[PDB]
Amino acid sequence: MTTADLILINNWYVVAKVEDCRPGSITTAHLLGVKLVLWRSHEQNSPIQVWQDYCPHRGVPLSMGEVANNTLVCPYHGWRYNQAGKCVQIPAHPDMVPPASAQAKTYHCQERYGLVWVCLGNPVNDIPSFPEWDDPNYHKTYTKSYLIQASPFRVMDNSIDVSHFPFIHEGILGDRNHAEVEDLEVKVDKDGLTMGKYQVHTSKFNNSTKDDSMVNWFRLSHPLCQYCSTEASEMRTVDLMVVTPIDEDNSVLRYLIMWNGSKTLESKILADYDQVIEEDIRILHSQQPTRLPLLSLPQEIHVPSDRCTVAYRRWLKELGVTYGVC
Amino acid sequence: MTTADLILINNWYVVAKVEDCRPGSITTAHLLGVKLVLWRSHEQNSPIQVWQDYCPHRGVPLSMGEVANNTLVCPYHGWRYNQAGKCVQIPAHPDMVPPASAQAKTYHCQERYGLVWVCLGNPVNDIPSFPEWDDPNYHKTYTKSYLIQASPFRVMDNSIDVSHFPFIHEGILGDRNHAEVEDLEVKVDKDGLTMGKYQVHTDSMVNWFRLSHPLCQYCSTEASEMRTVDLMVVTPIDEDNSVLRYLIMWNGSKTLESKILADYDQVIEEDIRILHSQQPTRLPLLSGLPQEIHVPSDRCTVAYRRWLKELGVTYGVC
Amino acid sequence: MTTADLILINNWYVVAKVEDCRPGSITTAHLLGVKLVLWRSHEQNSPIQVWQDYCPHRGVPLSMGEVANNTLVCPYHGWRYNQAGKCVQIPAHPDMVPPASAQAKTYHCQERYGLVWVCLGNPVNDIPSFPEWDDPNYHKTYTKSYLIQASPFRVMDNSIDVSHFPFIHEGILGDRNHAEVEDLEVKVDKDGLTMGKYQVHTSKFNNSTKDDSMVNWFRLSHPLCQYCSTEASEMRTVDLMVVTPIDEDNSVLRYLIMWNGSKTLESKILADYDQVIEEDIRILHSQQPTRLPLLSPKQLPQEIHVPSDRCTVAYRRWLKELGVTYGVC
Ligand SMILES: NC(=O)OC[C@@H]1N=C(N)N2CCC(O)(O)[C@@]23N=C(N)N[C@@H]13
Ligand SMILES: NC(=O)OC[C@@H]1N=C(N)N2CCC(O)(O)[C@@]23N=C(N)N[C@@H]13
Ligand SMILES: NC(=O)OC[C@@H]1N=C(N)N2CCC(O)(O)[C@@]23N=C(N)N[C@@H]13
Ligand code: FES
Ligand code: FES
Ligand code: FES
Ligand SMILES: [Cl-]
Ligand SMILES: [Cl-]
Ligand SMILES: [Cl-]
Ligand SMILES: [Cl-]
Ligand SMILES: [Cl-]
Ligand SMILES: [Cl-]
Ligand SMILES: [Cl-]
Ligand SMILES: [Cl-]
Ligand SMILES: [Fe+3]
Ligand SMILES: [Fe+3]
Ligand SMILES: [Fe+3]
């Protein structure tokens, strides 16, 4: 049984890309300790069902079955479950109405921004906003998924931290000889956590061109999804960073990236993200304790450039998070 | 050393094939949480000793030793144990009589049907009967062993289940156009659990089976021109792991042996795919989160769960 | 960060050889459940720092950093720690004085006999003596380190046991035609555990005794370091056996060996030790329970003891008397 807090259960999380879930497909995923099955009927534009991956007859994963005639069919005795999760046929007794108990545990699913979002509980909140999604001046791309052996809150803590840039992203986002961090603007309010415009010192790459001089800001409406905005020399790049909380100690990381420069930059964008992400994963894998320490092994130390990661920890306690934190 | 229920401790289980326990040999097995050593002296027709795999001096497995002169010799300090498990020689003190505590933990062992049977407790029952063993009209063959990451009681539950045949054994035991299951006849007695004759569809065979005890099943199938029986024996390694073996006998042509073994292998591997996936691992008795649902074609597997609860089984179940 | 008994925490243990800690190097070790980082400046004859492998800012291992300008630099935000473990530079705030909390957890470290000794607590004893260290008639050599999946107290128990020699070390320390064990002399007092001189059967002629044997004795001042002496044919070999208690169930084993015979014996000595150690590891890995059983007023079945077990019984009795509960059962 999931020990996640209600505040986490009642939120939306990404579990897959829509483009990887074809009609007729069966996909597995994991969310807040729960094993999920995602399936679609073979019809074009069919919805995605997201259920607990478990047949209540003899305990077989329904994901080992098959999709047929708009049902998911268990492999073991062939019980057929309709789109609402109700068993509508037991082959051993074809004239018998299946018992009302023969029902899959179903969850909420929405497709948004080409991503599959799931809510295991009763969705109080909305899916986070992504204003550029419907802007045709912006192209889109998606990173691969990254499976990370770290708490989802440590993953997000690292992506709120800006002072590490000249050290583990040396050569892309700065150098150890330019590591001073200016005062940061941070607010935690009704819109969530927002880091105000911050100047990022970048390493020179193309000697023919002007300095990149990027300015970054971001906002988290909810604690595992970050909207990030970067203004560079002649282009804006935005992204939605979504962390899937597999369990307390493990995460999946994905980005949806949009930019209003040339579509031909997609390869460079994906490779630059991959380089930065893997540098962060080396740190994340190593951090102890695995779960994120909240405010109160020696205690964490905080300096002024930690203002936003301190605010993140404060927010998590205000939210009542106990899962994935310590 | 085992924490299994007395009702399980006092029953017989197969742990090896006799052909693998040659004179002079040392082999191992694992039963109800206990590590076992099996050994024989080099004399022809010597008996098989089955002991806990543990030298009580400094805790080394006796299976790392050697068989010498009707004794098993521990590799660490060379203490020698005779066929009764009594230490008869301590090399550091060759004239000393070894203390009474210098004694291997021994278990009951009987060879039957070409199989090595072990009882860790006090045998209250005989080894299950297999009447065709003495019928020379029937040929015999043995499957290989199958190591399964599932509770032994889930392994047997899967074998008692007949309604899954059309879905995971299509072409050998079932037909997806004939998935309906007729009314089943099941009885639980002091003779054990018995399922009455049942039509299989694959032609049309008639099958029945009986379990005298919960982890050994006698199965009988009559086809057009042939009867096939088997003894299915499941070694309960622990609560969560099993060894599966079959002794198969049939009264048709001797030439059918390789096809019989191939068909069994196909069916067994199809079942193992399901067994490895089932959660929870241990077999739920009557009373993933939701509780089991039962329909009429589950009559025999429901009776099996009821029998285990009546017997007081708590090991390997939930 | 350790559940070890105070009697173990306040003792010295070897965690590395000095030759594996070159100037500028970062290495790791593990002691009583604590992850350690060992580092030195690039300077000639720089000291060895041994710290908990942990940056208290955001919990990254300092062993993932780099040595620069006689400081250890954390890879994540570049905090620089001096040889005393004090943070002297926070690059995000270059003119700010680091808070007093910005300090690595440091441990007592000493180099002796070419080995790196560490005490995680407050050392009550000196490092064991090794008198031949100063003697110019003795050559020295070092085995490699051996990682063993067994309790450090089982590792030492196996090294105090002599009656197994004819059975698992046949041809180096005994043979099965010479398996009888003489009455053993054992004492446990202020000096620790001592086994008195006893005869080990070999294959080479001893010119002092006029048969194929050697004379061995050993002493443990503390439960995980053994001084061992062996004499045959006018040549003497001594060693210091040091066990690193990684945690309750795992060990590192090292030997420092000195001998007064030919320098050409060195490779033979190393090969003999490697064979004997691997023979013992085969047994150690198989033993159950993993932790060393102590003696109990009571009655898996309890161990059995015979007279040739006198010194390993004394070892178990000593550990109970000392109050050891970690790595034993
Ligand atoms: N050019 C490039 O790789 O940018 C990465 C992109 N921009 C940041 N400032 N990052 C800091 C942390 C981070 O996760 O890498 C990210 N945060 C979000 N949302 N997207 C990333
Ligand atoms: N032709 C073939 O593979 O038959 C398998 C054989 N016969 C059955 N009806 N089975 C159903 C289940 C089962 O375990 O496979 C088995 N039960 C026993 N005792 N033997 C097997
Ligand atoms: N020639 C050779 O390999 O000798 C091993 C050497 N000498 C002993 N008598 N041993 C007995 C046990 C043991 O651990 O192998 C050891 N104990 C210590 N201190 N050093 C080893
Ligand atoms: S386990 Fe799913 S139909 Fe029986
Ligand atoms: S451990 Fe078996 S003889 Fe010593
Ligand atoms: S974690 Fe070491 S400097 Fe930040
Ligand atoms: Cl469909
Ligand atoms: Cl579609
Ligand atoms: Cl019906
Ligand atoms: Cl023999
Ligand atoms: Cl035959
Ligand atoms: Cl049985
Ligand atoms: Cl001590
Ligand atoms: Cl000494
Ligand atoms: Fe980063
Ligand atoms: Fe089957
Ligand atoms: Fe030894």
Among B115, B50, B55, B116, CA closest to B83: B50
What are the chain C neighbours of A287 within 8 Å (beta carbons)? 58-60
Site of tokens 């995971």: B168
Tell me the HSE value of C171 on the side-chain side, using a 13 A CA sphere: 5
| Alpha carbon distance A101, A85 (integer Å) | 11
Resolution in A: 1.7
When CB atoms are compared, the residue of B92, B102, B105 closest to C163 is B92
Any C CB within 8 A of B64 CB: yes
Method of elucidation:
X-ray
Verify whether ligand 5 is closer than 6 Å to residue B57 (CB atom). yes
- DSSP H helical segments within chain C, as ranges? 6-9, 152-160, 165-168, 266-286, 310-322
Structure letter (DSSP) for residue B177: T
Tell me the HSE value of A73 on the side-chain side, using a 13 A CA sphere: 16
Ligand in nearest proximity to the CA of C54: 6
Among A56, C314, C261, CA closest to B278: A56
| Cis upstream peptide for C91 (omega within 30°) | no
Among A199, A197, A203, CA closest to A173: A203
**Token reading at A115:** 């991503």
| Alpha carbon distance C107, C1 (integer Å) | 13
Chain Cα centroid distance, residue A68: 31
A39 forms bridges with which residues in the sheet? Answer: A26, A49
Provide the sign of the torsion angle of the four alpha carbons C121, C123, C129, C130, taken in this order: positive
Protein residue whose Cα sits closest to atom 16 of ligand 1: A159
Verify whether ligand 4 is closer than 6 Å to residue A77 (CB atom). yes
| Alpha carbon distance B181, A96 (integer Å) | 12
Question: Are A257 and A272 a contacting pair, CB within 8 Å?
Answer: no
Chain Cα centroid distance, residue A157: 13
Question: Are A279 and A271 a contacting pair, CB within 8 Å?
Answer: no
* DSSP line for A165-214: HHHHTTTTS--GGG-------EEEETTEEEEEEEEE------TTS----E
Quick check: C92 and A288 CB within 8 A? no
Residues 6+ positions from C213 with CB-CB distance below 8 Å = C199, C200, C201, C202, C206, C232
Protein residue whose Cα sits closest to atom 1 of ligand 5: B58
Chains touching C by CB (3 or more pairs below 8 Å): A, B
Residue-range domains of chain A with CATH: 6-119 (2.102.10.10), 139-319 (3.90.380.10)
Tell me the CA distances in angstroms from A24 to A50, A62, A66, C197, one per residue in order. 14, 14, 8, 80
Cα-based torsion angle of the residue sequence A39, A41, A42, A44 in order, rounded to the nearest 10 degrees:
-100
Residue ranges of E strands in B7-144: 13-17, 26-31, 34-39, 49-52, 66-68, 71-73, 80-81, 87-89, 106-112, 115-119, 139-142
Question: Are B34 and B61 a contacting pair, CB within 8 Å?
Answer: no
Among B190, B241, B180, CA closest to B211: B190
Question: Are A162 and A308 a contacting pair, CB within 8 Å?
Answer: yes
Question: Are B215 and B233 a contacting pair, CB within 8 Å?
Answer: yes
**Token reading at A60:** 């077989």
**Token reading at C74:** 């954390």
Element (H, E) at A156: helix A152-160
Exposed, middle or buried, C127 (CB in 10 Å: 0-12/13-18/19+)?
Answer: buried
Residue ranges of E strands in chain C: 13-17, 26-31, 34-39, 49-52, 66-68, 71-73, 80-81, 87-89, 108-112, 115-119, 139-142, 146-148, 186-189, 192-206, 211-222, 225-232, 235-247, 250-259
In which region does residue C262 sit, left (phi positive, over 0), alpha (psi from -120 to 50) or beta (all else)?
beta
Question: Are C256 and C228 a contacting pair, CB within 8 Å?
Answer: no
Residues 6+ positions from C230 with CB-CB distance below 8 Å = C200, C214, C215, C216, C236, C237, C238
Any B CB within 8 A of C290 CB: no
Q: What is the CA radius of gyration of chain C?
A: 22
Question: Are A229 and A215 a contacting pair, CB within 8 Å?
Answer: no
What are the chain A neighbours of B293 within 8 Å (beta carbons)? 56-57, 99, 101-102
When CB atoms are compared, the residue of A176, A283, A298 closest to C78 is A176
Any C CB within 8 A of A184 CB: no
Rounded to the nearest 5 percent, the helix, strand and coil shares of chain B are 20, 35, 45
Residues 6+ positions from B188 with CB-CB distance below 8 Å = B194, B303, B306, B307, B310
Question: Are A304 and A183 a contacting pair, CB within 8 Å?
Answer: yes
Tell me the CA distances in angstroms from B205 to A64, A275, A293, one per residue in order. 29, 63, 65
Any B CB within 8 A of C189 CB: no
Site of tokens 């004694």: B103
Relative orientation angle of helices B299-311 and B152-160, to the nearest 10 degrees: 140
Among B309, B159, B213, CA closest to B318: B309
CA of A89, closest CA in chain B: separation in Å?
12
C74 is in an annotated binding site: yes
Helix (H, G, I), strand (E, B) or coil at B297: helix
C189 forms bridges with which residues in the sheet? Answer: C192
What are the chain A neighbours of B174 within 8 Å (beta carbons)? none
* DSSP line for B217-242: EEEEEE-SS-EEEEEEEEEE-SSS-E
CA of A208, closest CA in chain B: separation in Å?
60
Residues 6+ positions from A242 with CB-CB distance below 8 Å = A13, A14, A115, A224, A225, A253, A254, A255, A256
- DSSP H helical segments within B83-200, as ranges? 152-160, 165-168
Question: Are C311 and C164 a contacting pair, CB within 8 Å?
Answer: no
The number of beta carbons lying within 10 Å of the beta carbon of residue A153 is 26
Helix (H, G, I), strand (E, B) or coil at C155: helix
When CB atoms are compared, the residue of B60, B76, B93 closest to C306 is B93
Quick check: A303 and C90 CB within 8 A? yes
Give the strand order in the sheet containing B66-68: B66-68, B71-73, B80-81, B87-89
Residue ranges of E strands in C190-234: 192-206, 211-222, 225-232
φ, ψ dihedrals at C11, nearest 5°: -110, 160
Element (H, E) at A231: strand A225-232
Structure letter (DSSP) for residue B201: -
Site of tokens 């006689």: C70
**Token reading at B72:** 């098993």
| Alpha carbon distance C235, C268 (integer Å) | 15
Protein residue whose Cα sits closest to atom 5 of ligand 3: C273
| Alpha carbon distance B295, B297 (integer Å) | 6
Tell me the HSE value of B232 on the side-chain side, using a 13 A CA sphere: 24
Query: Looking only at Cα atoms, what is the longest distance across chain A?
Result: 78
